[PDB]
Amino acid sequence: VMTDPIADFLTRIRNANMVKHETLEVPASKIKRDIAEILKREGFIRDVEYIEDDKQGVIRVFLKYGKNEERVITNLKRISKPGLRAYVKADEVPKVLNGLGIAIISTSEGVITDKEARAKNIGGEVIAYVW
Amino acid sequence: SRYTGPSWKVSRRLGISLSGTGKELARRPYKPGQHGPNSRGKVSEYGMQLTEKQKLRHMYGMNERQFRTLFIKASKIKEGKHGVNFMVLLEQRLDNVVYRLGLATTRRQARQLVNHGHITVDGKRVDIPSYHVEVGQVIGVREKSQNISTIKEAVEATVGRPAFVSFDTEKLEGSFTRLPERDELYPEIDEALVVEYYNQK
Amino acid sequence: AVKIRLKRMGSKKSPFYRIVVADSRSPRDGRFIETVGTYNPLKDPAEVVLKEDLVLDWLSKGAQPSDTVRNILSKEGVMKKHHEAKNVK
Amino acid sequence: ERNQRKVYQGRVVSDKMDKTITVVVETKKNHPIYGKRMKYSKKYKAHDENNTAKVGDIVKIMETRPLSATKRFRLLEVVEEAV
Amino acid sequence: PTINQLVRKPRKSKVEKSDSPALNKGYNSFKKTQTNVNSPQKRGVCTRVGTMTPKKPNSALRKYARVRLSNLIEVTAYIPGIGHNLQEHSVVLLRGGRVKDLPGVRYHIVRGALDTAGVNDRKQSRSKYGTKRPKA
Amino acid sequence: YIDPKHLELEDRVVAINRVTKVVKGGRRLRFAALVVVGDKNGHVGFGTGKAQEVPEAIRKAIEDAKKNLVEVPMVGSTIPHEVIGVFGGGRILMKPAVEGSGVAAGGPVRAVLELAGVADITSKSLGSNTPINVVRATVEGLKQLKRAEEVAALRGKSVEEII
RNA sequence: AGUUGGUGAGGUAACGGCUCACCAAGGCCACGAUGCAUAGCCGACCUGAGAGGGUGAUCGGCCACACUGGGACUGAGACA
RNA sequence: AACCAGAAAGCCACGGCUAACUACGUGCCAGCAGCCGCGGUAAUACGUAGGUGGCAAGCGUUGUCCGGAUUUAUUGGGCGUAAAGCGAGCGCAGGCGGUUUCUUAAGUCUGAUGUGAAAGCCCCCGGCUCAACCGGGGAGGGUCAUUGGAAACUGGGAGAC
What we know:
Radius of gyration of chain B: 18 Å
GO biological process, one term (chain D): translation
Number of strands of chain B: 4
Distance between the termini of chain B: 25 Å
Distance between the termini of chain D: 36 Å
Number of helices of chain B: 8
Number of strands of chain D: 9
Oligomer: part of a larger assembly
Family (chain D): Belongs to the universal ribosomal protein uS17 family.
GO cellular component, one term (chain D): cytosolic small ribosomal subunit
Organism (chain D): Enterococcus faecalis (Streptococcus faecalis)
CATH architecture of the domain at 90-182 in chain B: Roll
Shape of chain B: globular
CATH superfamily of the domain at 90-182 in chain B: RNA-binding S4 domain
Order of helices and strands of chain D: EEEEEEEEE
Protein name (chain D): Small ribosomal subunit protein uS17
């Protein structure tokens, strides 16, 4: 039973990153598209396009590789998995690798990064890291 | 006591300049005891740190118990470095203002003169050896009888007047000049094994 | 029967008091209601440091200072201003 | 009203006793060591006048004064009743 | 394990023992109660004294004494040194510490701390064994 | 990468072992040491050899050790971020520190860190404690260490919006 | 099994099964009731990177006890 | 205030961990030991000798509590062979859940207000000729309590695929 879709999306990104090819096909929905836009404007993704007929997605992911076959996104893991929910206040917001990565926080205004979160004094639920 | 020997058998085993080349070397560097004419093995890295601590203990004569507290408060800056600022704070002692400036000759002249109370500072008689002297504090030498010639016998052979504390002669005024570094006050070597000995002490 | 009085806080031979308002049932150094000023026994003249919006508004509530506390707080003429100014009515 | 009481919501389990219902308020806490959202329940006993509510109604109640052998709140308002 | 399996299990612990269980008096007066009484040392009376042989690989005659204490429990003990001030039927005060090569004993007595006296020649380690320093 | 033997060196012997091989009749026995080599400015390496005497064995270990050199990127004489390295049981935790706070690291890892030019660091062994795998896991962890200009230049964005 | 609710009366500094007289059989429990064993509670103290672990003697606050167990009186206030 | 350095220094270990030695009579007995282990002409483990080596009226030993112990692992562990997937299935209670519109706002974050006694541990500044004593400030004492907002996520209601 597919009891969490977000972890499926993140493991699909890691499995596509590990064996090093360029495309990815995800049966998708609204929160997946929103974190895709977060990563796109933060540039961990090279590009995205959107193809939907009537059903889950799909979002096609155009991964990013370096100019000498190196990989720019190195790990990716969830925080508030369904069963142990995790909530972080506005002055407990983490700063990963001394700010070298980012973190996805579903604030009360929506889904933003950590810098925009600390620039508004809003905590919220942390979805996942990426660095 | 704060001294338990001739300071010659004890300072033989160390054999260091003590400290800023205040030189007393006649026949230091050969080995103490009656293992002396024979050889000895290598030194563990615990033993080197031990000899570093015992070097900085028979120099002054002070305690463990105040070294810790004087070591803690150099993090009052909170944008800077600890043991360097500790080396700063380690020489604002009322004994250290005597020695490293030019108020008298030696550290034991400082401590013996400030063990019974034969100095005055700032307005009244004092006796405290470890006084945290700060900026602009005229430290005297018991001005009620400071014009005995042995005081001015002590002032003339100057230890050194760096840019950390200045000196005046006519009144024995010493005032903290600028914020120094390591390279000026005790150039420049011995810090490393002491702070290693007090990390998991 | 509230009663503003002293509270001894010395070391061994050198005391230091604080003028404090406490019920008479309470012990010498037990609880109180609030600390209204203080007084070194030593170093005459030792200061009566106050907000003095408390004494004027506290004897008017109804309280009785003891021997030492009244006979040093009379140096600001506190209740004489007050029962002088009960003619305001 | 110069001082407020505390009013609680909840629903009704059983009211077989005269002039008396049973109100369950309900929320979720955390474990003190671990972290998931455990849920639990209480059973108050509130005083009612003349058989207003029934089984399954969301009702709300107010802290009153000691009214009986521990039934201590007063009913306010039948809000949402089903059959 | 997982999370709500750790919620409905208490996640227990690994309760320690002691090493000297006759220094915790399971009382004998009035109504013969239990401990409140974590002690550094006890006393008692000897009931037989002799010697026994150690384990592998040693070969000697290790001297012992069996002493019943105030708390009505009997534990064997070891006697140290050459020449002893604690013998048959006296007060004897106990340390806590196990001698390895001997089986079935885990206390040895202090000696120089009662009626007993102590050292004769160890002028460097004279803390042990009970006797004041020759002051020259 | 083709490692130049043109900067200075500095040495520290981590541990030696007397190691046997039982053959017919007697027992062969050999010494084997373990020496890290660095310049304390950002090029440190290690190596080992074996012989039947200590000075020849440590000569062979130094001669092995001059063929491996590592970047160890720095900022403010301190690690950029958190590093957890794993190699066969060597979980080694490392973390940036405050200026002047020293080195918090035991025997076979202080010899690595001090001989590279780091003075503000914490470390803790976690798992294996045999001295070979500790050093290999240390260099395995430091190999994973990233760099500010690297990450700022990887994505199409620039530096100073990520600091 | 005065256990849970209702009606009425008494009593108390006042509400109330607190106590009586009558009527109906209610109430609590896996979210651990009832039972056995240990223990006064807190500001705090020691320790640790921290999460925590251990302790409740000096000084301050509350509760409870006067050889053991009952019971009232005087008194604003005690079941002293 | 007249005169003195006289009146006025202590204690345990040295085979490895353990920095901190060498040598002499003792001879698998007498003995030592926190762990590893020492004793049959050597004990560099009994006595002697100088030393050596440690804090500043102390120094060893016993007992108890926390650390090192990621050796109950939430932060922070595992189950092919090392301890460890029930012999296997059916299922009450419980845990957890596909996509979407509207809606409540229990959980969520945040503004303001009230309190978290005094003394402690902190920090700054004074006196106590330096330990100890007091003074004024602040995070410090909440999973707190009331009042006002968000509907991104999970609960709840109405529907849709």
